[PDB]
Every structure is written in C-alpha cells, then in structure tokens.
Amino acid sequence: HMMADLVISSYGGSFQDAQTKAYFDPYAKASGVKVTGTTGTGYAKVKAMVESGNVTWDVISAESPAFASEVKDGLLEPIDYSVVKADNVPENFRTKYGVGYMVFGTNLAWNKDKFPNGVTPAQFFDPNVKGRRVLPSDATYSLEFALMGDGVKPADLYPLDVKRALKVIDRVKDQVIGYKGASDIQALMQQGEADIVYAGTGRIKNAIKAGANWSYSWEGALADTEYWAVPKGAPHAAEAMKFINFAVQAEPQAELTRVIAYGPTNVDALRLLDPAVAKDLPSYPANAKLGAVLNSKWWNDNYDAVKAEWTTYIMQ
C-alpha cells in the first residue's frame, strides 16, 4: 500500500491547477492516497532521473514528441492493462508505455489592444508587424507554426523542412522576446509583457478568464495528444496504474475539459459537458481545417538531430 505521496510531474500553472481539480484531488479523495503534484515533466528531465536510478516521479504527463523520445530510450514502465480498464478510450490512445488522456491545440494568440484586427500566422512571421513575440521553448510546435505561417499547407507539413522553418523564424527572431514553456507564456500574457504568442488553447482561454484582453484563432494551430506514463524504476509504479485508470474515466476527463479548454480521449466524456465546449476543441471541423495535427512518427525519427540544431539556433 501507499505509505507516502504518489508524485505526479506536470507543466505547472493553470493546466496543473486544472489537473489537480479534475484528477489529483478526486483520486486522493476516492483512494485515500496522498497525491502530490510537481513540475519539470519533459524528455531531458525523465532521462536524467531514470538513468540516475534515483526516480522520484511516479506519474508523468508527456506530450507526444516527449513521449516518443522516452519510449525510444526505454525510460518508461509498460502500462498494466489489467489495472487500466477503459474500453471507452480508443485503443490507439491505449499504447504499450502510455495512455492518451487529452487532446490539445497550440494556437496563435494576440493582445487585442495592440492588435484589434487580430494576427494571422503570415503576420506573425512578417518583420513589418511590430510586437513582442513568444515562441515555445523547444523545436516542437515552433517549426510547424513557422512553416504554416510561411504558407506550407497543413497537409504538406511532414517531413518538416527544418532549414526553411528556421529561415522563417529568422525573419522575426529579433522581435522574439523568448522561447518559453506554457506557465511562462500565460504569466507574460497576464502581465502584458508580450503582444503575440503560440501557446496551449487552455492557457490562452484561462489568461482571458483571469482578465487578459487577448484573442486567438485556429489558423496555423497544431493539435497534439497528451499521455499519462510511469518512469522506469518509479517507486509507486503499481499505484501509478491505479491513478491512470481513475483519471481516464468519463467523469474526471469531463471535469478536466470543464475547467480548461483541452479535449478528452474518453468517448463518453463530451456528453457530460456543455455542447458549446466542442467548438473550442481541435477536432471541431471548423477548427481542424485551419491547422494540422502533430506527426509524432516524424518527431520520433528526427527529434535528436533537430534538437542539436535548435539549441545552437536559440543561443544565436
């Protein structure tokens, strides 16, 4: 049994606040287990922890390119499907080393006072459009936005033309104030320290709810899948499977979407929600046609080479 906290690593800020309300606190109440949310999730951190042999994280939230790299390096425990019992979660989300629990869009957002007529992906990469820009911390999401912004059709994205994408970012690189994580981006929006960003739909909508006079579009947006995974050598690997089972059920999945504008993988969650929530999701036909879906197969094969270039690229 659990004699200490079940440690869950995520992204912090409003998204972790949402996960705590929908998954962490309800599981703690249902199981009697102490659940502690932490930050730092990512492939580099998971690798360092697992390879050290000093594993302090029991459950991780992994975005599909980070998840792909973790699987490739044998950093995760296989999911116990005798424990994770969710026939209403499509089999393609129920993978060997992780369970797809959320579908999320990454969108172009603008401050309405600086840009009342909005910003298109073409205008984001236009040197003549003046404004403090924030791009994501890694090459993932960033490269696809640069390419769609430069006129690459969403259907023609992969294999990513990395050279072109970087030459595209090069046009507005002097106006890019940072390459930040989701929590840092939401704080910059709320503090009015940026004018144009590329961030998670839920982070944008939560900043607006909190008073940020910002807007966004689905033009050049990138949709991705978020996974629950268990680091290899996790001290509470068996309890982690019990948390994952709980979290992927219709009620916790619907509670997540209620608080933050990210979509469920459980097919029975949306009928529990306001019909209007469907319009703020990447799968919505009017939204889907304007952007693309991240290809994790491409990132699985190309992440290491792209990362080696990206690190040197953002270090000027």
Ligand X SMILES: O=C(O)[C@@H]1C=CC(=O)N1C[C@@H](O)[C@@H](O)[C@H](O)[C@H](O)CO
Give the residues lining the site for ligand X (CB under 6 A): 11, 15, 63, 104, 106, 136-138, 140-141, 181-182, 200, 202-203, 226
Q: Distance (Å, rounded) from C-alpha 312 to C-alpha 266?
A: 40
Nearer to ligand X, 45 or 112 (CB): 45
Kindly state the smallest distance separating residue 292's Cβ from ligand X, in Å. Answer: 15
Nearer to ligand X, 2 or 314 (CB): 314
- Specify which residues 133 forms β-bridges with: 176, 196
Read off the DSSP letter of residue 153: -
Kindly state the smallest distance separating residue 203's Cβ from ligand X, in Å. Answer: 5
Kindly state the smallest distance separating residue 117's Cβ from ligand X, in Å. Answer: 26
Q: Distance (Å, rounded) from C-alpha 61 to C-alpha 101?
A: 9
Residue partners of 31: CB distance under 8 A and separation at least 6: 242, 243, 246
Nearer to ligand X, 37 or 136 (CB): 136
Nearer to ligand X, 33 or 280 (CB): 280
Nearer to ligand X, 100 or 131 (CB): 100
Kindly state the smallest distance separating residue 190's Cβ from ligand X, in Å. Answer: 14
DSSP letter string, 164-199: HHHHHHHTTGGGEEEEE-HHHHHHHHHTT--SEEEE
Kindly state the smallest distance separating residue 268's Cβ from ligand X, in Å. Answer: 22
DSSP letter string, 192-232: T--SEEEEEHHHHHHHHHTT--EEE-STT-EEEEEEEE-BT
Nearer to ligand X, 106 or 245 (CB): 106
Kindly state the smallest distance separating residue 307's Cβ from ligand X, in Å. Answer: 10
Contact 80, 241 (CB under 8 A): yes
